Design a protein around this nucleic acid. Sequence first.
DNA 1: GGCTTTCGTCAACCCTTTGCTTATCTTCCCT
Lengths: 177, 247, 302, 302
Amino acid sequence: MIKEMIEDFISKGGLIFTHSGRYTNTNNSCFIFNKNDIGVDTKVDMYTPKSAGIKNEEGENLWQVLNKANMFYRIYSGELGEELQYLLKSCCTAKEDVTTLPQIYFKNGEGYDILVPIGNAHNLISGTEYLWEHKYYNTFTQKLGGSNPQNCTHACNKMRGGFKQFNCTPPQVEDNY
Amino acid sequence: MRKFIIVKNVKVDGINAKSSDITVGMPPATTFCGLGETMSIKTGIVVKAVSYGSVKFEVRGSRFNTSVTKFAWQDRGNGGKANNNSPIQPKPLADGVFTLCFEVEWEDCAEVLVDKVTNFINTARIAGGTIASFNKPFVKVAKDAEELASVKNAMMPCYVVVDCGVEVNIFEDAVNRKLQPMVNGYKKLEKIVDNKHMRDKFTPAYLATPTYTMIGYKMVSNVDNFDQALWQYGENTKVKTIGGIYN
Amino acid sequence: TKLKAPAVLAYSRKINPTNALMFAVNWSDRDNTTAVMVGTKTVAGTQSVRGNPNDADKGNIQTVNFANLPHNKNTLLVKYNVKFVGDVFKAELGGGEYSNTLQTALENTDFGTLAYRYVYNIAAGRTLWRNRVGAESIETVITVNDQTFTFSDLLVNEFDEDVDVAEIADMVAGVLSGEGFVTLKVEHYMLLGEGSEVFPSQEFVENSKLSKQLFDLNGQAAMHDQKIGNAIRTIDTWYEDATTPIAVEPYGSVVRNGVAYRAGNKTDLFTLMDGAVNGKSLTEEDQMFVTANLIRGGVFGG
Amino acid sequence: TKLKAPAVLAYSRKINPTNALMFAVNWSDRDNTTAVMVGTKTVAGTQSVRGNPNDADKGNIQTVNFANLPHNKNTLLVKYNVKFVGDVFKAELGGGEYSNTLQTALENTDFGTLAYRYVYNIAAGRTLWRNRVGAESIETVITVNDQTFTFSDLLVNEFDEDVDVAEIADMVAGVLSGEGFVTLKVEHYMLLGEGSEVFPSQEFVENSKLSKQLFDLNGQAAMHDQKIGNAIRTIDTWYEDATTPIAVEPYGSVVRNGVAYRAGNKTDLFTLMDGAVNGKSLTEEDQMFVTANLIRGGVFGG
DNA sequence: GGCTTTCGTCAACCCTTTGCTTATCTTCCCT
């Protein structure tokens, strides 16, 4: 069931987000749902304390069912009901914490803004799925939560093999020339 | 009429290779633009653009995994757990020998400009890495375009960063056209209402998600226009090249 | 009354060492620097894990990165620089109330002993853990502000008094207690012997190919910079039941040995830091410990 | 009440041999040393294999690295440097409780017998593994601290008492029971005969393309340090039904015979160090086995 | 009334194994 799951999520801490500083630091717990970047194939992350939640008859938590066949966009555009839109949006909140997060200065013209860079969840999940699908092996793989990533993030709880990030090494200069 | 100061062979180790969540490796142009505005603050020489190239760069780790850092128990209140190993948050480290070239405008002799840049670099930190060594910086000027290329070829040997733009998104074209992605800036999500836990209480703060552009590495001599390698702070809370998209 | 600490108070690292490039030289020609190359060998042995008597009988094959001296050079040279940076009390994330009252309780830190133990950890060869043993003769050459010193025999587990390390410590304590920076270019000449195996930094990396993967820099054996930073700050002989110097940690915690010597007995960095801020008369040795933590830096969550 | 071992309790190795370069000399011209080159020869024979007798008539072409003495020098020389380091009880990764109680339970260990068997394994030529067969005389020159020690005829399966191996082993046991280090510059002169084929270590290779690939250092035939270290610690005559000395493993396990001489019958090393830590008095050769494991090194936890 | 310590709570993977680029060079001319 799906409503059962959305409410299982809500009895708990109940956060649905597209960006978070939880990937940068597991002690951080800042979860941000941006509205503008939600599209047809936008992967969407969610947080529960210790990734809690019941499974269905096929053994999947809410993170699997909300992320295949564009189900989160289907609930987001209300093809399955406007009261479900409400349930989804009740979990879609912006919780903020700046501790254990990077804080840099970016020039905004005759002044600076303290930007706190938090990582995009759609980038992590969709990039891991795509670069494993499209055989792109110029990459690093990192398990984010540590030994037991369920305290981090539902995607870190389920994708235990590690997230794919880009190997951004430049070409070297050969010294003997 | 353009003026540059070049610091060649900037051996830096301990570089925070975590450029973003999905990019680990060479520090992006936001890092070197931040280094440029850092000297605009400490030394007072106001910097328009920085062209940076990689002589050497190795991410610490294997070809598929980075070497994680053994964390130290430095938070408050978790004594008693300090005997066990500290939990590791992901921060890859790297070493890199760089060549930096700062567009500056200066009105004094080149010796005091070199001394000011040297005194900055002796107290600087490239991407969170201690600057292990660096050659004596030298001043070169770009009066014309041939002189611009003289400055360009004075960074030999280094692989500078040229912007090649975003067609659809980052993953698609990184597989298709095989270019490298890096942070060209950030996107502001929400205003931050709590300035207590920040560096300044008066500087306005935003949560950010890093936007990326797609870039290529070309040797500085093989770059036709040096403006396509000089990154500078654009007015879209991003950074950009002076020459635009490399073609 | 009761000035609380900032939640995310942070300090920058003030002892910044570089990566220790390992070269191969002779005791005769110490100018014949030759990059000790990280080689890769494959190892046949017996698997002997605590719970493996059933599989003890079978073999165990591991590919391991090794680093040995070549058989024509008997001396391991270690290259790094150490940059001591001033402004050790300028917090970059903590506010100007707790950190400044922290600072003004710490001018009475005797920086001379801190600098003496830092330069003695540099000079005695503490940054050379498993290859300072088995060395026939160590020799540390420290070059700073175009002036050069040499140390032959310094015992590493205690800080005995010599005028040369104290003479370097004068300018190091002048930088640390004051402003600016100072840089010591360190040359370790370690007479290990002909073809003796050297010990670079091993990496904390998930590697399917290499069971043991060493740290290389262009293939050349090298040691991690934070490893040498842990070596230089290994000055803490002031914890409870102090026998050997441990690294300056906020909790005095060697997770390598599984023991935290300053945790739970009210002598960690945070209790002494709150005592220094809130006007409690801090001891000289606790003062030097808090100052050494501020020199090391760190973020302090709470 | 039971003191469990630390999960990451590990001991560094204390016998550190170098890679043993092989040269060619004469029994008289030991000053004329020419490096034994590793050549590569393509060799055709029968298919053999225990199964598949249908393809017995087909040939078998394998390319094999060989190492032979030249036909002008009849003596194989093997050079290596054994570094016995001390502090064998300080675990580098487990220092604390268990490790230190093992130390106090192993203070009265007969280090003289362990050092005697180590120096005898160096002196009798056991580090030569398959080179010894066909050698008419094996003369070992061990130079300790500028101390030439000549050995001519020592049987290998038993440790018969002599005065020169014991003379070296006095200060080797002084190093092992105490601190410091000692270096043994070992040369093996073996009258193998004119043009005799010598047997270096062979690399483990999975990419194949060459059936036997010998260990080489710049082309010169050499032996792996691990093989020499296995032969030095081949001192274990204290297992159940002990007939020949075996190498010291935690499980008493050699992998050619596919057995474990000390697993499954409560004299593997983990049970003995658990007994010695928990106040169960070991016998003398039991303590010598546990201390020989600590001298060998390894990791004992989990 | 927080507050700091330690113990209990909640989990579960599908992996792949080098190039990225690839270096700053002589015609006229007259002194």
